Every structure is written in structure tokens, then in C-alpha cells.
Ligand binder design. Sequence first.
Ligand SMILES: CCOC(=O)Nc1cc(-c2ccc(C)c(NS(C)(=O)=O)c2)nn2c(C)nnc12
Length: 126
Amino acid sequence: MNPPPPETSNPNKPKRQTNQLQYLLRVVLKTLWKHQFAWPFQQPVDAVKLNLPDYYKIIKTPMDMGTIKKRLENNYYWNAQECIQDFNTMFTNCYIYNKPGDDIVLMAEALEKLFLQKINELPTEE
Ligand SMILES: CCOC(=O)Nc1cc(-c2ccc(C)c(NS(C)(=O)=O)c2)nn2c(C)nnc12
């Protein structure tokens, strides 16, 4: 079975809309989402569909760009670090679960190289 997806809505969690979070949506997420290699990362890993009952035994902090997109569009975050951590969790989960050189790892590595380039240019808070 698949676990429930990560939280994307919680009225108890305090929220902000900042210029760094806007950059994460309008520059970072947009660039990565349109990459040719983005598609396996655009929704939670579907262990049922892939017949991978082991995935959620190994990966206990799942994350994906569909969840991140919802968090950004629905103003779930307080700060940019929360969102950057989600991206980093997504990449590291892929490297933990899969073998070096696997197609999915090469795809994640291409997205991560672009992510790092965009994050290096993160604007100062206004
Ligand atoms: C032991 C074999 O290892 C794997 O198959 N690994 C991985 C596979 C895929 C993957 C493939 C095909 C499809 C159709 C999907 N779609 S989805 C997002 O709905 O689940 C995902 N994503 N993936 C991610 C992220 N991280 N690892 C993997």
C-alpha cells in the first residue's frame, strides 16, 4: 500500500509569502518541472503501481515535486529553508533507494545540478 502523501494543507501551521519563496516557485520549481527528466518526480512514488513494496520500508521521509508545487502554490511554508530541504530530501531519497548509475539517479542528478545553480542565485530577503 502507499502511505498518505506528505502534508500540503494545515491551517494550524503559520504561513508566509516571501520573495525567496516566490523565487522558489517562479524560478526554481518552474525550471525543474519542465526539464525532460522531471516526470518521475512530479508526484509521490507510487509503490503500488511500480510493485515496489520495499520502497516505503527504505524511504521514511518521502518527497516529490508535486508535493513541493502544492506547498508553494498553497503557501504552506514559513521560509525558503523548509522548501529547499524538501528538494534535498527528494534527491537524497532517490540516491538512497537506487543504485549509482541507474537511469533514475542520472535523472535526479541532472535536476539537482540545475537546482544548485538556481539556489546559488537565491535573492536576499526583502
Ligand atoms: C527498484 C527499481 O527502482 C525504481 O524503479 N526506482 C524509481 C522509479 C521511479 C518511477 C518509475 C516509473 C514511473 C512511472 C514512476 N511514476 S510514479 C512517480 O507515479 O511512481 C516512477 N521513480 N523513482 C524515484 C522518484 N526514485 N526512485 C524511483
